[PDB]
Design a protein around this motif. Sequence first.
Motif, PDB file in Angstrom:
ATOM      1  N   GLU A  80       0.375  -5.785   1.492  1.00  0.00           N
ATOM      2  CA  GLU A  80       1.415  -5.645   2.558  1.00  0.00           C
ATOM      3  C   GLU A  80       1.487  -4.181   3.010  1.00  0.00           C
ATOM      4  O   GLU A  80       1.577  -3.288   2.191  1.00  0.00           O
ATOM      5  N   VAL A  81       1.446  -3.968   4.304  1.00  0.00           N
ATOM      6  CA  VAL A  81       1.503  -2.560   4.825  1.00  0.00           C
ATOM      7  C   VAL A  81       2.723  -2.368   5.728  1.00  0.00           C
ATOM      8  O   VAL A  81       3.009  -3.188   6.579  1.00  0.00           O
ATOM      9  N   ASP A  82       3.419  -1.283   5.519  1.00  0.00           N
ATOM     10  CA  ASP A  82       4.617  -1.005   6.360  1.00  0.00           C
ATOM     11  C   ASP A  82       4.237  -0.058   7.501  1.00  0.00           C
ATOM     12  O   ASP A  82       3.838   1.066   7.271  1.00  0.00           O
ATOM     13  N   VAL A  83       4.366  -0.533   8.708  1.00  0.00           N
ATOM     14  CA  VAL A  83       4.009   0.327   9.875  1.00  0.00           C
ATOM     15  C   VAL A  83       5.080   1.406  10.094  1.00  0.00           C
ATOM     16  O   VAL A  83       5.373   1.770  11.216  1.00  0.00           O
ATOM     17  N   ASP A  84       5.638   1.889   9.012  1.00  0.00           N
ATOM     18  CA  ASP A  84       6.694   2.942   9.125  1.00  0.00           C
ATOM     19  C   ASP A  84       6.405   4.085   8.144  1.00  0.00           C
ATOM     20  O   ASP A  84       6.483   5.244   8.499  1.00  0.00           O
ATOM     21  N   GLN A 133       2.027   4.502   8.587  1.00  0.00           N
ATOM     22  CA  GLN A 133       1.448   4.449   9.955  1.00  0.00           C
ATOM     23  C   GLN A 133       0.030   5.025   9.948  1.00  0.00           C
ATOM     24  O   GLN A 133      -0.713   4.867  10.897  1.00  0.00           O
ATOM     25  N   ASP A 134      -0.314   5.679   8.875  1.00  0.00           N
ATOM     26  CA  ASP A 134      -1.673   6.273   8.782  1.00  0.00           C
ATOM     27  C   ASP A 134      -2.717   5.168   8.649  1.00  0.00           C
ATOM     28  O   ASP A 134      -3.823   5.284   9.138  1.00  0.00           O
ATOM     29  N   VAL A 135      -2.334   4.122   7.989  1.00  0.00           N
ATOM     30  CA  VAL A 135      -3.267   2.987   7.801  1.00  0.00           C
ATOM     31  C   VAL A 135      -3.167   2.023   8.977  1.00  0.00           C
ATOM     32  O   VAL A 135      -4.129   1.386   9.350  1.00  0.00           O
ATOM     33  N   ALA A 136      -2.000   1.933   9.531  1.00  0.00           N
ATOM     34  CA  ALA A 136      -1.813   1.028  10.688  1.00  0.00           C
ATOM     35  C   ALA A 136      -2.542   1.592  11.900  1.00  0.00           C
ATOM     36  O   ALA A 136      -3.213   0.881  12.619  1.00  0.00           O
ATOM     37  N   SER A 137      -2.393   2.864  12.092  1.00  0.00           N
ATOM     38  CA  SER A 137      -3.064   3.516  13.246  1.00  0.00           C
ATOM     39  C   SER A 137      -4.576   3.546  13.017  1.00  0.00           C
ATOM     40  O   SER A 137      -5.335   3.923  13.888  1.00  0.00           O
ATOM     41  N   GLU A 138      -4.978   3.147  11.843  1.00  0.00           N
ATOM     42  CA  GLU A 138      -6.419   3.136  11.528  1.00  0.00           C
ATOM     43  C   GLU A 138      -7.029   1.819  11.998  1.00  0.00           C
ATOM     44  O   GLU A 138      -8.190   1.751  12.350  1.00  0.00           O
ATOM     45  N   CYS A 139      -6.223   0.802  11.989  1.00  0.00           N
ATOM     46  CA  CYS A 139      -6.707  -0.531  12.444  1.00  0.00           C
ATOM     47  C   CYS A 139      -6.426  -0.689  13.938  1.00  0.00           C
ATOM     48  O   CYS A 139      -6.752  -1.695  14.537  1.00  0.00           O
ATOM     49  N   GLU A 140      -5.820   0.319  14.506  1.00  0.00           N
ATOM     50  CA  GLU A 140      -5.500   0.270  15.961  1.00  0.00           C
ATOM     51  C   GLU A 140      -4.722  -1.004  16.301  1.00  0.00           C
ATOM     52  O   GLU A 140      -5.029  -1.681  17.262  1.00  0.00           O
ATOM     53  N   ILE A 168       0.858  -1.222   0.000  1.00  0.00           N
ATOM     54  CA  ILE A 168       0.000   0.000   0.000  1.00  0.00           C
ATOM     55  C   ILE A 168       0.883   1.256   0.000  1.00  0.00           C
ATOM     56  O   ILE A 168       2.094   1.162  -0.031  1.00  0.00           O
ATOM     57  N   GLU A 169       0.255   2.404   0.032  1.00  0.00           N
ATOM     58  CA  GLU A 169       1.039   3.677   0.035  1.00  0.00           C
ATOM     59  C   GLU A 169       0.422   4.674   1.022  1.00  0.00           C
ATOM     60  O   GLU A 169       1.117   5.276   1.817  1.00  0.00           O
ATOM     61  N   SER A 170      -0.873   4.828   0.948  1.00  0.00           N
ATOM     62  CA  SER A 170      -1.553   5.782   1.874  1.00  0.00           C
ATOM     63  C   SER A 170      -3.005   5.350   2.109  1.00  0.00           C
ATOM     64  O   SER A 170      -3.396   4.256   1.749  1.00  0.00           O
ATOM     65  N   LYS A 171      -3.775   6.219   2.711  1.00  0.00           N
ATOM     66  CA  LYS A 171      -5.204   5.876   2.978  1.00  0.00           C
ATOM     67  C   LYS A 171      -5.987   5.812   1.670  1.00  0.00           C
ATOM     68  O   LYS A 171      -6.636   4.827   1.373  1.00  0.00           O
ATOM     69  N   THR A 172      -5.910   6.862   0.920  1.00  0.00           N
ATOM     70  CA  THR A 172      -6.638   6.896  -0.377  1.00  0.00           C
ATOM     71  C   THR A 172      -6.357   5.618  -1.157  1.00  0.00           C
ATOM     72  O   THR A 172      -7.198   5.123  -1.881  1.00  0.00           O
ATOM     73  N   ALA A 173      -5.175   5.118  -0.990  1.00  0.00           N
ATOM     74  CA  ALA A 173      -4.792   3.873  -1.700  1.00  0.00           C
ATOM     75  C   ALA A 173      -5.457   2.657  -1.048  1.00  0.00           C
ATOM     76  O   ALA A 173      -6.144   1.900  -1.703  1.00  0.00           O
ATOM     77  N   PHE A 174      -5.232   2.500   0.231  1.00  0.00           N
ATOM     78  CA  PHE A 174      -5.840   1.339   0.948  1.00  0.00           C
ATOM     79  C   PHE A 174      -7.299   1.155   0.517  1.00  0.00           C
ATOM     80  O   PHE A 174      -7.824   0.059   0.539  1.00  0.00           O
ATOM     81  N   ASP A 204      -1.240  -7.867   5.439  1.00  0.00           N
ATOM     82  CA  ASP A 204      -0.141  -8.251   6.377  1.00  0.00           C
ATOM     83  C   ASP A 204       0.461  -6.991   7.002  1.00  0.00           C
ATOM     84  O   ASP A 204       1.418  -6.438   6.498  1.00  0.00           O
ATOM     85  N   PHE A 205      -0.118  -6.562   8.086  1.00  0.00           N
ATOM     86  CA  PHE A 205       0.397  -5.338   8.758  1.00  0.00           C
ATOM     87  C   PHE A 205       1.671  -5.653   9.543  1.00  0.00           C
ATOM     88  O   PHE A 205       1.619  -6.172  10.640  1.00  0.00           O
ATOM     89  N   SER A 206       2.791  -5.329   8.958  1.00  0.00           N
ATOM     90  CA  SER A 206       4.087  -5.595   9.644  1.00  0.00           C
ATOM     91  C   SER A 206       5.113  -4.530   9.248  1.00  0.00           C
ATOM     92  O   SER A 206       4.843  -3.686   8.418  1.00  0.00           O
ATOM     93  N   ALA A 207       6.266  -4.592   9.849  1.00  0.00           N
ATOM     94  CA  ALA A 207       7.317  -3.585   9.516  1.00  0.00           C
ATOM     95  C   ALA A 207       8.248  -4.125   8.424  1.00  0.00           C
ATOM     96  O   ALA A 207       8.661  -5.267   8.467  1.00  0.00           O
TER      97      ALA A 207
END
Length: 105
Positions: A56-60, A63-70, A5-11, A26-29
Amino acid sequence: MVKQIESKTAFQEALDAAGDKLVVVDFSATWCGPCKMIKPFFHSLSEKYSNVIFLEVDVDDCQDVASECEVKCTPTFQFFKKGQKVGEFSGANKEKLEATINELV
């Protein structure tokens, strides 16, 4: 098949271009080691399952999408369908992915 992914609009678009087939994220770093150490397992499915969608999402850098899934602990596997969460389980358990996919398959 896997896609980062890249950002929210993308997700959002991803869940819009994945039709309705299983959509497992796969939310991981990506920078961390032990995190991307489970790649030959979740990333090697791009060939096996050619009908399922994998993201695949990078929590780095996202973080905008990761912090969205809490999230609360990486790696964190999430299941999306039609744009709605139906399953979610975290832990360094990869052998669980398979069976889990058999859950919403």
